[PDB]
Coordinates of C-alpha atoms and ligand atoms in Angstrom, one line a residue:
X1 CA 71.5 128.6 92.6
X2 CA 74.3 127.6 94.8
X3 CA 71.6 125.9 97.2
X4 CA 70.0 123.7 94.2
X5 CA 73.3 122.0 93.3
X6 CA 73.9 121.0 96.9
X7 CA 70.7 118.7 97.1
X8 CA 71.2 117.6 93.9
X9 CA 74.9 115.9 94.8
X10 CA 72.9 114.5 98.2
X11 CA 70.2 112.6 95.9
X12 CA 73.1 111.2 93.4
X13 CA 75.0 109.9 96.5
X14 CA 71.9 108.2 97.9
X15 CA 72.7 105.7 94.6
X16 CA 72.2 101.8 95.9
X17 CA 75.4 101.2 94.2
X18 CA 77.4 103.5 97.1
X19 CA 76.1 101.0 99.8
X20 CA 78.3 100.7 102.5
X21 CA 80.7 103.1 100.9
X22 CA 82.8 105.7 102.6
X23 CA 82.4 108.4 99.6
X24 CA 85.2 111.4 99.3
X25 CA 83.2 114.9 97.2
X26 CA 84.8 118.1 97.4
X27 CA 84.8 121.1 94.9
X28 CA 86.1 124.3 94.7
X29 CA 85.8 127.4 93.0
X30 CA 89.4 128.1 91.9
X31 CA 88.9 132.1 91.6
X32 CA 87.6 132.5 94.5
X33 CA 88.4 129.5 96.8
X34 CA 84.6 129.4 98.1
X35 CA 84.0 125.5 98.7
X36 CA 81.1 125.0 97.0
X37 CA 81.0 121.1 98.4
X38 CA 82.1 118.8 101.2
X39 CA 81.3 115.6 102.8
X40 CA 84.3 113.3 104.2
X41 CA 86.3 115.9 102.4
X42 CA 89.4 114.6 105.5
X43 CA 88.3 111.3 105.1
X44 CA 91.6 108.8 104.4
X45 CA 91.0 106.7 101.3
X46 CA 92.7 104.4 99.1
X47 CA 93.4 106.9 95.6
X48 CA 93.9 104.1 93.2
X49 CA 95.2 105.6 90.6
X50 CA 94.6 109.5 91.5
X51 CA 97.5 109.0 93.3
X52 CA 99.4 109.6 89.4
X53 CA 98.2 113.5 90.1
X54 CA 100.7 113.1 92.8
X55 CA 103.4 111.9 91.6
X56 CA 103.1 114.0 87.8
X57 CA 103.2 117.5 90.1
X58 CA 106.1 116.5 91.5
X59 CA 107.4 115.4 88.6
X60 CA 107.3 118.6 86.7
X61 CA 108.6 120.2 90.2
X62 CA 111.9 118.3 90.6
X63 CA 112.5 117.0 87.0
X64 CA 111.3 120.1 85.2
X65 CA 108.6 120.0 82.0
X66 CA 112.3 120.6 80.1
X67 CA 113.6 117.7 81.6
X68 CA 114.6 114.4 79.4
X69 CA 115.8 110.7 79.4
X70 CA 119.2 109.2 78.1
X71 CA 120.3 105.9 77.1
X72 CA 123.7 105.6 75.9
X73 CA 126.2 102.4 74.6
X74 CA 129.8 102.5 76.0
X75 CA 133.3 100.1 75.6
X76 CA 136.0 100.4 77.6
X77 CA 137.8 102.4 74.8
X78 CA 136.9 102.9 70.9
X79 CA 137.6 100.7 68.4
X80 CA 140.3 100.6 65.9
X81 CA 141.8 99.0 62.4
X82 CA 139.7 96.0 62.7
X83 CA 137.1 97.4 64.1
X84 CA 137.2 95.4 67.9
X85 CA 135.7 96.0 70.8
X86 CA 135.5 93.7 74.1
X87 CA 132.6 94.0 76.3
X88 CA 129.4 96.7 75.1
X89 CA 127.2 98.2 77.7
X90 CA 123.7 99.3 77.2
X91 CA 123.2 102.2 79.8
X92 CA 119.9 103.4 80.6
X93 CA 118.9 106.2 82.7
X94 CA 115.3 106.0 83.4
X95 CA 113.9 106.8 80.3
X96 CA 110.4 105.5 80.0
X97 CA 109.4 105.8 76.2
X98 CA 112.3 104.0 75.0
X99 CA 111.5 102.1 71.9
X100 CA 112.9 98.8 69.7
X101 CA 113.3 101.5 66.9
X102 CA 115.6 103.5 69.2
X103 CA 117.3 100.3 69.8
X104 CA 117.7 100.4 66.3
X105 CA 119.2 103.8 65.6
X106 CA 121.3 103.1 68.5
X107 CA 122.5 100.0 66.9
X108 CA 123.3 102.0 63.7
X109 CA 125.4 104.6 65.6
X110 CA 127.3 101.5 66.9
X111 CA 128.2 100.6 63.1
X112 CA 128.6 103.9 62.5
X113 CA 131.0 104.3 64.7
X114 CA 133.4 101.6 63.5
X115 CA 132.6 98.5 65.6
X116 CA 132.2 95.2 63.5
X117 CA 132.6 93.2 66.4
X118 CA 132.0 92.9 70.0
X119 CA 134.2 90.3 71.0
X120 CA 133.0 90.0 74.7
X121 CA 129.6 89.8 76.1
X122 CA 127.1 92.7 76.1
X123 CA 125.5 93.4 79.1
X124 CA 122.5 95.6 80.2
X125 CA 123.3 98.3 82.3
X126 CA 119.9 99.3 84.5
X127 CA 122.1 100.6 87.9
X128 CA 121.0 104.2 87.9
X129 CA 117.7 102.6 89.8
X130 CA 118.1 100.0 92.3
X131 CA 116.4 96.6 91.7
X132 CA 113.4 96.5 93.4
X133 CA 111.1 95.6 90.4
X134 CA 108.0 95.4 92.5
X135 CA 106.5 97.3 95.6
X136 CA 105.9 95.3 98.3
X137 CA 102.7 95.1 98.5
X138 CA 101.6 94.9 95.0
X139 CA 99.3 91.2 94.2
X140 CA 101.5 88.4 92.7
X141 CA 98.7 87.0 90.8
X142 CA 98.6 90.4 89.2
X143 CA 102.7 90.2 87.9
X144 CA 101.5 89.1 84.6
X145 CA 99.5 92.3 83.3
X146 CA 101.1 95.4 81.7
X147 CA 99.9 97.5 84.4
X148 CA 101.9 95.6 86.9
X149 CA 105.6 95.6 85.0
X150 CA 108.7 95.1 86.4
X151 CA 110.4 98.5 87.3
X152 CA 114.1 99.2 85.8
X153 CA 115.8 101.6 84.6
X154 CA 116.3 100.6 81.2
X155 CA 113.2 99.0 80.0
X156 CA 111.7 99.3 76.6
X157 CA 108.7 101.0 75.7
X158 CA 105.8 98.7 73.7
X159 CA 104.0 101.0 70.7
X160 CA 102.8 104.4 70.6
X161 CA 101.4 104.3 74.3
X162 CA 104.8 103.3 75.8
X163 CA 103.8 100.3 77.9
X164 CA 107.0 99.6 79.3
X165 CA 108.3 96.1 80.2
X166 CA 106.2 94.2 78.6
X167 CA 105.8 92.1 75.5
X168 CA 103.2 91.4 72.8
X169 CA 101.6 88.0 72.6
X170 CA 99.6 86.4 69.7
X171 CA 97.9 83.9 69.3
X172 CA 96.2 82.5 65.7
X173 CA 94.0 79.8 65.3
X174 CA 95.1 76.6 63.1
X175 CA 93.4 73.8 61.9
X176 CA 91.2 72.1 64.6
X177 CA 92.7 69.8 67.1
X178 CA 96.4 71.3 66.1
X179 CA 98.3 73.6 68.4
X180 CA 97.4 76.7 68.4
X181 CA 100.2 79.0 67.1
X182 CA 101.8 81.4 69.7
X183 CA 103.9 85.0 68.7
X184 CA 105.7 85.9 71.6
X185 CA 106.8 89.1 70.0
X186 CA 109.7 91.2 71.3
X187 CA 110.1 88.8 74.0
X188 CA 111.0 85.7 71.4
X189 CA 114.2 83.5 72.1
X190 CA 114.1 85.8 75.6
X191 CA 111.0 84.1 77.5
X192 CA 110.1 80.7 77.6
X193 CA 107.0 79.3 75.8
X194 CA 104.9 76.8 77.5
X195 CA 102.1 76.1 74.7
X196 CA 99.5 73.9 75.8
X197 CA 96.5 75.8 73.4
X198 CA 94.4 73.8 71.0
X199 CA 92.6 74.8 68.0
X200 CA 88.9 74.3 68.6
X201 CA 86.2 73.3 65.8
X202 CA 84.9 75.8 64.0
X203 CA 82.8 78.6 66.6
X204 CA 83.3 76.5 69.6
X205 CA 83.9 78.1 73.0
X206 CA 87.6 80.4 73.9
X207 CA 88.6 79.2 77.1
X208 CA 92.1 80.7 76.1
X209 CA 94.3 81.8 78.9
X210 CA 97.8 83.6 78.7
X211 CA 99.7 83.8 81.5
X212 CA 103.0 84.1 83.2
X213 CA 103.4 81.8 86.0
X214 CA 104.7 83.6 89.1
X215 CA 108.7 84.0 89.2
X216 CA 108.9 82.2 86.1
X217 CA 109.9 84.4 82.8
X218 CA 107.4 81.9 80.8
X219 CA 104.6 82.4 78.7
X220 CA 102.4 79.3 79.6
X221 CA 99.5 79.2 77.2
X222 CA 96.7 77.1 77.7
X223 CA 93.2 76.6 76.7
X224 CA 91.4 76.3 73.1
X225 CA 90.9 79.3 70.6
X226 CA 88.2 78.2 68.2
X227 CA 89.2 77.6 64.3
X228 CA 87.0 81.1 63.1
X229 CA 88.0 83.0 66.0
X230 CA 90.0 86.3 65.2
X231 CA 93.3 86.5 66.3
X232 CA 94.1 87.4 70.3
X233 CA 96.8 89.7 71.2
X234 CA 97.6 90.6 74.8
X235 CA 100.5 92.3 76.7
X236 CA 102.2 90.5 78.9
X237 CA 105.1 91.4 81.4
X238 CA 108.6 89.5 80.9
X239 CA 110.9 89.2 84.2
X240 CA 113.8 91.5 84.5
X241 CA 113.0 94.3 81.7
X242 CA 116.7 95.3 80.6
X243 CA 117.8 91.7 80.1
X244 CA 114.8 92.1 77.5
X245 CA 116.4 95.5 76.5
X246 CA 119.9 93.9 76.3
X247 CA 118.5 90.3 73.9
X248 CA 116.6 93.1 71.8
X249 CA 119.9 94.9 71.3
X250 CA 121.7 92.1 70.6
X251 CA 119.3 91.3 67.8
X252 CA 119.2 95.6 66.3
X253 CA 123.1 94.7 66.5
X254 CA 123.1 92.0 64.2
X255 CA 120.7 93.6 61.9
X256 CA 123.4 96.7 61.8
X257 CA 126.3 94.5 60.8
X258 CA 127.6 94.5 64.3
X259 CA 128.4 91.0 65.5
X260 CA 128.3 89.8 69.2
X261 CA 131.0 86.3 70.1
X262 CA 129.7 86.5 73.9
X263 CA 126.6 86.6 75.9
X264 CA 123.8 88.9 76.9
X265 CA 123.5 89.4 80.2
X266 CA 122.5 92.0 83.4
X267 CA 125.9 93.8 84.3
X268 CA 127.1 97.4 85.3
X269 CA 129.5 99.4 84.0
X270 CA 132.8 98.6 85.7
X271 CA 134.6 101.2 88.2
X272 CA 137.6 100.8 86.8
X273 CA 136.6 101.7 83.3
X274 CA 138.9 105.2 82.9
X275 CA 137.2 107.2 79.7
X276 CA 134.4 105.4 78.7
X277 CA 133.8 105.5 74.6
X278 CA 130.0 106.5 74.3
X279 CA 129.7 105.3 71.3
X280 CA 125.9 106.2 70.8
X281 CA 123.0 107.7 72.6
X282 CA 119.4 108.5 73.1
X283 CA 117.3 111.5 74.1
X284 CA 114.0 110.9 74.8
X285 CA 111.1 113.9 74.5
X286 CA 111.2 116.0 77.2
X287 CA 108.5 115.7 80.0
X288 CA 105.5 117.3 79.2
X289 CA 105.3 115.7 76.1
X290 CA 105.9 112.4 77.9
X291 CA 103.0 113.6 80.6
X292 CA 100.4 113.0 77.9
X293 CA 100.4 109.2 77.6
X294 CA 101.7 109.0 80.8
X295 CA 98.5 110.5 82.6
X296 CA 95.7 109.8 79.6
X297 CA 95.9 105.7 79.5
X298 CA 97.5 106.2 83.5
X299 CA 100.7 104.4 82.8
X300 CA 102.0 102.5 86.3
X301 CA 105.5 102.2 84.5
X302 CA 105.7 105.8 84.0
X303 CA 104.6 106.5 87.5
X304 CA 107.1 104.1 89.5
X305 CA 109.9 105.6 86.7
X306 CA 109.2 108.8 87.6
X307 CA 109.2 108.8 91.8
X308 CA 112.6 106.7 90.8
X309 CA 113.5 109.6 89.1
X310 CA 113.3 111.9 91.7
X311 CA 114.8 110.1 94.1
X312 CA 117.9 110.4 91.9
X313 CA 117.7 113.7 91.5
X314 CA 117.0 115.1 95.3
X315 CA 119.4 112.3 96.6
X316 CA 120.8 110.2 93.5
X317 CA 119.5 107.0 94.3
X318 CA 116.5 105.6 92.1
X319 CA 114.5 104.2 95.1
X320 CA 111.1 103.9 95.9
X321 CA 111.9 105.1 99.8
X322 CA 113.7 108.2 98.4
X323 CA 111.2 109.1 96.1
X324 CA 108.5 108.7 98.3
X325 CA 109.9 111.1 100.4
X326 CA 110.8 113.3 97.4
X327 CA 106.9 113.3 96.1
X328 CA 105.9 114.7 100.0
X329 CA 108.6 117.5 100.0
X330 CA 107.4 118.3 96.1
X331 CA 104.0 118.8 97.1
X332 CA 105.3 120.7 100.0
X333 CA 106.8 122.9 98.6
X334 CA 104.2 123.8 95.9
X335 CA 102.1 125.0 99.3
X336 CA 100.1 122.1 99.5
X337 CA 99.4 120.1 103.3
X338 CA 100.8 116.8 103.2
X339 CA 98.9 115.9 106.7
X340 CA 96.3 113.5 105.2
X341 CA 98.6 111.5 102.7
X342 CA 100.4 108.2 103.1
X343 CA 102.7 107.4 99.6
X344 CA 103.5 104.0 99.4
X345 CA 104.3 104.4 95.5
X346 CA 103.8 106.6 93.0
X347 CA 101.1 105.0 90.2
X348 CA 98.4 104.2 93.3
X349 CA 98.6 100.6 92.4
X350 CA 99.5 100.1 96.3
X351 CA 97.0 99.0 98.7
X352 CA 99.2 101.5 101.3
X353 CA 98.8 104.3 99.5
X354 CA 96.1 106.7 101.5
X355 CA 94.6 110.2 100.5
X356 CA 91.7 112.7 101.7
X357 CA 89.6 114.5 99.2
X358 CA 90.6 118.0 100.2
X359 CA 94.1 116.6 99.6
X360 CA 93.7 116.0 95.8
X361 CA 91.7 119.9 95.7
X362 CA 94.5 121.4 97.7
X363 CA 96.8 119.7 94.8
X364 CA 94.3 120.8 92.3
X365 CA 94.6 124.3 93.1
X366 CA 98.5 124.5 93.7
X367 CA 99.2 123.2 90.6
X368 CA 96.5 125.1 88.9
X369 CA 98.6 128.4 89.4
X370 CA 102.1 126.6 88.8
X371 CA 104.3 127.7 86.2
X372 CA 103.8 124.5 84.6
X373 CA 100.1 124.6 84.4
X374 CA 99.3 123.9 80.9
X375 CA 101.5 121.0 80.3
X376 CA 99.6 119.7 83.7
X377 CA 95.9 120.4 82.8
X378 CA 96.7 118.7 79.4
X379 CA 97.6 115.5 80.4
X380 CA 94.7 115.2 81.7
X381 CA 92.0 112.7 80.0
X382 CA 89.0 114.7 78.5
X383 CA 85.5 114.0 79.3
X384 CA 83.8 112.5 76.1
X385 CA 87.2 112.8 73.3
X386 CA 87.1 109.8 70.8
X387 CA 90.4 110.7 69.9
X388 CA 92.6 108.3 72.7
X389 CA 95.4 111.0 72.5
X390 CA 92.7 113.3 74.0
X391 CA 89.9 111.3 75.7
X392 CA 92.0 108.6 77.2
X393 CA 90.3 106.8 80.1
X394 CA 87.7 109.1 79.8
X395 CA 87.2 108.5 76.1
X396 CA 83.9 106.8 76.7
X397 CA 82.4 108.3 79.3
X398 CA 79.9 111.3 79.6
X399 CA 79.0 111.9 75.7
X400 CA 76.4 113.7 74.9
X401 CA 76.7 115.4 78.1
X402 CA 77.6 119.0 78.9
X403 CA 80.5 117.2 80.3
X404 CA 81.8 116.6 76.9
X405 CA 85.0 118.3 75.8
X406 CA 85.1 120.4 78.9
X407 CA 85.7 118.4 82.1
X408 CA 89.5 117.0 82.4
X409 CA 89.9 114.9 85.2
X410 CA 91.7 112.2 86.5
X411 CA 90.3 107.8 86.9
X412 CA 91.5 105.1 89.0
X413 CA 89.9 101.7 90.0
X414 CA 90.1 99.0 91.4
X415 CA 88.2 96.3 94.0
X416 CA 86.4 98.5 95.9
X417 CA 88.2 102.0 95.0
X418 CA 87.2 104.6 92.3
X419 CA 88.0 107.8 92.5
X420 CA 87.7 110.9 89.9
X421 CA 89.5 114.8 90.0
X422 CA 89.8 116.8 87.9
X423 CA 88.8 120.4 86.9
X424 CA 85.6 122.0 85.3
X425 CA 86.3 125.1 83.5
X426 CA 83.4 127.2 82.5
X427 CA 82.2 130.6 81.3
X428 CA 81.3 131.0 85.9
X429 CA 84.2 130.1 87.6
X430 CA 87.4 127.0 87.1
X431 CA 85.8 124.3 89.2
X432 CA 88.1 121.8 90.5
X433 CA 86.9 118.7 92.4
X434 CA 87.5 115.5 93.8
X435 CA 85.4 112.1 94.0
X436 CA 86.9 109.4 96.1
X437 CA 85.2 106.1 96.6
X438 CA 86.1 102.6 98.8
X439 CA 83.9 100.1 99.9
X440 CA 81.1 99.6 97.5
X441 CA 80.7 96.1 96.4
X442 CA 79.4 95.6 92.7
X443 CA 80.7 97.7 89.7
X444 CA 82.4 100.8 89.9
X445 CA 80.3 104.1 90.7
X446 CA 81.0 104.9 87.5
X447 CA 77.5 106.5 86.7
X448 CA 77.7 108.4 90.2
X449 CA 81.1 110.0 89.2
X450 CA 79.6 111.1 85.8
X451 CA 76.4 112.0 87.6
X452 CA 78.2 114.8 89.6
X453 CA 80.9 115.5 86.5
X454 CA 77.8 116.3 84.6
X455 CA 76.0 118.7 87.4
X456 CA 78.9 120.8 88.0
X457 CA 79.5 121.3 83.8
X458 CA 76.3 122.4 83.8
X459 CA 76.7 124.4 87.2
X460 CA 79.7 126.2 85.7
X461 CA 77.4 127.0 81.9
X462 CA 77.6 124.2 79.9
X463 CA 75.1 122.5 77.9
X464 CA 74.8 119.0 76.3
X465 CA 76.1 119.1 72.6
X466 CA 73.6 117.3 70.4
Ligands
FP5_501 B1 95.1 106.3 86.4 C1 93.8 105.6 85.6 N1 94.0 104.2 85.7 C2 93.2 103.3 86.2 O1 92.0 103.6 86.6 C3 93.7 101.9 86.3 C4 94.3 101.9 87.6 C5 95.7 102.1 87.7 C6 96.3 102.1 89.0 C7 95.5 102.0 90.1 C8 94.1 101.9 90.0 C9 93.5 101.8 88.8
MG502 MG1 114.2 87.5 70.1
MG503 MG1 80.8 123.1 76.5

């Protein structure tokens, strides 16, 4: 029985698509701790974005599944009779789901609170990380996607998925041969537009391009969308995320009554400031709720947020070198062996970043038996779930299969790097495995990673649902 499955994981890993690829497989029973396969299971490999079941099990060790985000608006002292205040400050601290609505019942609190007017300039407070927005290795040409954002501490959060630091743009057909029209959303009278999109005739070819041209914060559209085409939408990333934050709150201000006479701009809260006035503030959810459409859709943000997280709270300084470190210990001290791993940041977006396959099972089981294992194993996408909240990146893959509804595991790809880990309970024994792929050359050994997924479902007493 045992014997079967191995030469079946041989034939789907003779695929031509795994041609001159180095290919990470490893699974283990969890009861028992009987490895029921290896092959490269020491092998170094680029994670891409497995690397996220890194950084979440830290995470929930350092930060807590308790643990939540602040935001907060402070003057120098309260206001009085005529309602006066000099300079605002929006603090953040980290919080990743913030949202234009909490900006709003922020704003609210402000006029709540007796301020009519801020009579100086309001300034976005993002100091509790450093200012590294990118790692250093991370593509340039890549800046302008949401996967790629800026990293700050006070950034806001786009929709129900949180894609931090980024704005929506749209863009609607008009009459042929006039501009196109251009939304920038959130990020309007903040980024620059350069519009250089035409209106096509009527089911001509879209040859529309959005993009932000490198260390520039403007949206230079070009191209022509055709007269019948539907309306595009894409997220794009703006430069410096809190100065977004800060015009955003400037805005929720006026629309509370609250009046700004100076500018919006990136500041921290001054030393010499005594007591403060908070005069509102934000809690975010605590993290495990924040794990699920952190580790469902894989949110970079969230990752990079989160290492910068623990880097403030093992040392106090929201760095990407003190997190780093803070990830290793993490995983440490949950009993797994660090030997194999090489962090270079925390959503596996870096090109540094390095794994083995017995690695991610080691994690797999350590975190299996944590205290915070449910809040882990459900933020995990779901084999095969329409529902986004529950399928996630795996929404779509390995229906019909006795993989459906049963295998959670963890995605990640890029050029040349696909990996899958996850776990598959069953009626036998809690499988958990790891599939870690680099150098293959076409598409992504998608079909291979289901292939396997599939076997071991069925290995562990599950059948196709039809
Ligand atoms: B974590 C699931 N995400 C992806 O597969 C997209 C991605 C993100 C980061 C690195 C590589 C791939
Ligand atoms: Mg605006
Ligand atoms: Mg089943």
């Amino acid at each position: 029985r045992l014997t079967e499955l191995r030469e079946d994981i041989d034939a789907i890993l003779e695929d031509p698509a795994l041609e001159g690829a180095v290919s990470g497989v490893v699974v283990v029973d969890t009861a028992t701790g009987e490895e029921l396969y290896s092959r490269d299971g020491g092998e170094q490999l680029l994670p891409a974005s497995n690397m996220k079941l890194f950084t979440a099990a830290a995470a929930l060790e350092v930060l807590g599944a308790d643990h939540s985000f602040g935001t907060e608006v402070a003057a120098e002292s309260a206001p009085g009779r005529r309602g006066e205040v000099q300079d605002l400050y929006l603090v953040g601290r980290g919080d990743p789901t913030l949202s234009a609505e909490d900006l709003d019942a922020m704003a609210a609190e402000v006029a709540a609170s007796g301020v009519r007017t801020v009579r100086g300039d309001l300034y976005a407070d993002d100091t509790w990380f450093d200012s590294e927005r990118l790692v250093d290795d991370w593509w340039p040409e890549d800046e302008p996607y949401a996967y790629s954002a800026q990293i700050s501490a006070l950034t806001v959060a786009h929709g129900e998925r949180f894609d931090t630091g980024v704005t929506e743009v749209s863009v609607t057909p008009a009459a042929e041969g006039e501009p196109a029209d251009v939304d920038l959303g959130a990020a309007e009278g903040y980024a620059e537009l350069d519009n250089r999109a035409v209106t096509g005739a009527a089911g001509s070819a879209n040859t529309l391009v959005i993009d932000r041209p490198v260390g520039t914060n403007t949206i230079a559209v070009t191209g022509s969308l055709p007269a019948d085409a539907a309306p595009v939408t894409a997220l794009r990333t703006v430069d410096e995320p809190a100065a977004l934050a800060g015009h955003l709150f400037e805005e929720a201000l006026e629309s509370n009554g609250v009046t700004v006479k100076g500018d919006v701009g990136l500041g921290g809260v001054p030393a010499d400031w005594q007591d403060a006035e908070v005069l509102a503030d934000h809690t975010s959810a605590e993290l495990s709720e924040i794990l699920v459409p952190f580790m469902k859709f894989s949110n970079n943000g969230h990752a990079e947020m989160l290492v910068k997280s623990i880097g403030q709270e093992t040392a106090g300084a929201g760095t990407w070198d003190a997190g780093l470190v803070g990830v290793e210990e993490a995983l440490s001290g949950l009993g797994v062996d660090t030997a194999g791993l090489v962090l270079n940041d925390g959503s596996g977006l870096s090109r540094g970043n390095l794994v083995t396959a017995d690695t991610v099972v080691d994690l797999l089981g350590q975190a299996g038996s944590a205290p915070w294992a449910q809040t882990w194993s459900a933020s995990l996408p779901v084999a095969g779930e329409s529902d986004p909240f529950v399928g996630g990146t795996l929404a779509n893959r390995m229906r019909g299969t006795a993989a459906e509804g049963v295998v959670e595991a963890k995605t990640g790809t890029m050029s040349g790097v696909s990996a899958l880990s996850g776990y598959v309970p069953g009626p036998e024994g809690e499988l958990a495995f790891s599939i870690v792929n680099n150098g293959h050359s076409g598409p992504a050994p998608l079909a291979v990673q289901d292939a396997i997924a599939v076997r071991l479902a069925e290995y562990a007493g599950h059948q196709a649902p039809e």
